[PDB]
Structure 1
Amino acid sequence: ADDYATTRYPIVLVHGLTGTDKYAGVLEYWYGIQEDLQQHGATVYVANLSGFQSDDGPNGRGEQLLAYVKTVLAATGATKVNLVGHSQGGLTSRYVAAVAPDLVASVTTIGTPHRGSEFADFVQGVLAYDPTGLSSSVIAAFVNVFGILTSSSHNTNQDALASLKTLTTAQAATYNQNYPSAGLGAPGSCQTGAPTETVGGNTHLLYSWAGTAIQPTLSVFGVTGATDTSTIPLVDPANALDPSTLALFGTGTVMINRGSGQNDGLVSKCSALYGQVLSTSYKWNHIDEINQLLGVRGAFAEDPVAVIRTHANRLKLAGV
């Protein structure tokens, strides 16, 4: 054990959609990652927010995270935190950095849909095809109940229709208008913005990375193929041991046919770009990014624990 990852300010890990600190109180969202960071000297706190909510709004994840951050500061005696968000958690982290900029030293986003998800667009379009709303009522109720039952604290504030809308491309574009950041490039550029921001006189270091396991191949009859570059084709252990591997290849194929380009199954490379983009080359699907399921990743996927650890060192060397 050592101080490789000892940052000045505590690290707050911020989960995305479906999440909680520990599913059913048994499976860490950030599997193995708090342990590894702490072994290397980081002070690490894991937020437990609604798995299904918007980021803004009085009932949203942003205000939940703000309240949590204030408790972390009081406990640690620190004046700021380093926010590290996966998936929607990067959007939640942006909210806190905008509304409480004096409490934040840095924002790092991992597979965050800054520009939304084409898969969310697909789901919302399908629900809109039923004019009765019954599909929305039934599916969202099931998802909400999943959220309640799997939340470590049985948090009953679960609104799957709000989270779905939040993660659409149209709504993300509105979010970016409402909560701008210098870390964002222009819409449609597929390029990042500035590596730092000063918000209300408070400087924030901005970082991101993305997984691009799912790559487009050939188009035949208007249908574009895809391949999962994380895996040995077909026979990779990850296809057998982690049900998300094949599922995210499928969702990523759908997204490619909606015009996403390369993606992690749920978030495109372009959507994920923010601040200083440290990599978009990891052969990762969306939950490989958080060392899931149970550390299982394709043979060609880099170790996400080591990537996060190295980033804590980067933060340390940057003075946060």
Structure 2
Amino acid sequence: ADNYAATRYPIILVHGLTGTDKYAGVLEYWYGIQEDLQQRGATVYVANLSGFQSDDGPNGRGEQLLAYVKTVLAATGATKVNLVGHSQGGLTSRYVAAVAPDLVASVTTIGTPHRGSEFADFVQGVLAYDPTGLSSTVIAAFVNVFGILTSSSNNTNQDALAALKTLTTAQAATYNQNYPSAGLGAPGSCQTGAPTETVGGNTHLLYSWAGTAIQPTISVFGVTGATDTSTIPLVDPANALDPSTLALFGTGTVMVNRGSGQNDGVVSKCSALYGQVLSTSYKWNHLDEINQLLGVRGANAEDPVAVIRTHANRLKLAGV
């Protein structure tokens, strides 16, 4: 152990949709990451928010995170925290940074759909094809139960329908209007914004990176085929030991056929851009970003634990 990742302010990891700090109280969302960071001298806390909800609103993940941030500060005696969110977690972090700027020192998003997800649009579109609308109710009930059951604390505040809408591209654009950020570029520009922001007199260091394992590699008869660049073609063990590898390749293919361009199976490169874009070259699918499942990744995928560890050091050197 050492203090390679010893940051001034406590680090809080923020999970995305379907998440919880510890699935069924057994499998941790940020697989092996909290242990690694702490071994390197960092003070880390893992948020436990609704796996299914919008980010804003009375019952949203945003207010949940705000309240959690406050308990972390009170317990540590620190005055600010570094927010590190994955997927939707990044949106929840942006919410706290905006409404409570004085409590945040930095915001880092990993594969966060700042502009929404083409796969979210897809899934929502699928539900709309049921003229009776009953599938929304039935499927929502099923997902909500999954949320309650997998939540480490069996949080009953789950709203799959609101979570799905929150992640669509049209809704994401609206979210960015209500919660503007200097770290965001112009919509439809596929560009990032500034590396830092000053809200209400409080400066925040902004960072981000994305996984682009799923690449468009061939187009024929209007159809676009992709390639999972995270794996060694065909024989990669990650395809057998991690069920999400191929699943994400499948969802990633649906996205490129919806005009997403390179992605990680859930979030496009353009949608993930925020603050200082450290990288968008990682050959990662959406779950490799959080060292999942159970630390399995394709042969060509960079080590997610090391990347996050190095960032903690980056934050340290930056003064936060």
Q: Normalising to structure 2: TM-score of the pair? A: 1.00
Deviation digits for residues 162-205 of structure 1 (CA, Å, limit 9, x no counterpart): 00000000000000000000000011111110000000100000
Query: C-alpha displacement at 1:131, in angstroms?
Result: 2.4
Superposed CA deviations along residues 123-142 of structure 1, whole A, max 9, x for unmatched, are 11111111211111111111
Q: Does 1:109 align with 2:109?
A: yes
- The Cα offsets for residues 10-37 of structure 1, whole Å up to 9 and x where unpaired, read as 0000000000000001000000000000
Query: C-alpha displacement at 1:65, in angstroms?
Result: 0.2
SS in 1 for 2:234: coil
- Alpha carbon RMSD of aligned pairs, Å? 0.4
Secondary structure of residue in 1 paired with 2:226: strand
Q: Over residues 110-161 of structure 1, what are the superposed CA-to-partner deviations in whole Å (9 max), with x where a residue is unaligned?
A: 0000000000000111111112111111111111111100000000101000
Paired residue total: 320
2:23 is the alignment partner of 1:23: yes
Give the whole-Å Cα distance in 2 for the aligned partners of 1:175 and 1:230.
Answer: 31
Q: What is the CA–CA distance in structure 2 between the aligned matches of 1:26 and 1:76, rounded to whole Å?
A: 26
Partner of 1:20, secondary structure, is: coil
Q: Deviations over 1:210-235 (max 9, x none)?
A: 00000001111110010000001121
Q: Deviations over 1:68-110 (max 9, x none)?
A: 0000000000000000000000000000000000000000000
Runs of 4+ aligned structure 1 residues displaced above 4 Å come to none
Partner SS, residue 206 of structure 1:
strand
Q: What is the CA deviation profile of residues 263-320 of structure 1, one whole-angstrom value per residue up to 9, with x for unaligned ones?
A: 0000000000000000000000000000000000000000000000000000000000
CA distance in 1, matches of 2:238, 2:5: 29
| Pair 1:38-2:43 in alignment | no
Q: 2:134 matched to 1:134?
A: yes
SS across alignment from 2:225: strand
| Larger deviation, residues 76-85 vs 120-129 | 120-129
Q: Give a deviation string over 1:238-276, Cα, whole Å, max 9, x none.
A: 100010000000000000000000000000000000000
> Which range moves more in the overlay, 128-137 or 71-80?
128-137
Q: Deviations over 1:24-52 (max 9, x none)?
A: 01000000000000000000000000000
In the alignment, the residues of structure 1 paired with residue 132 and residue 178 of structure 2 have an alpha-carbon distance, to the nearest angstrom, of: 31
Mapped to 2, the partners of 1:133 and 1:208 lie a distance apart of 38
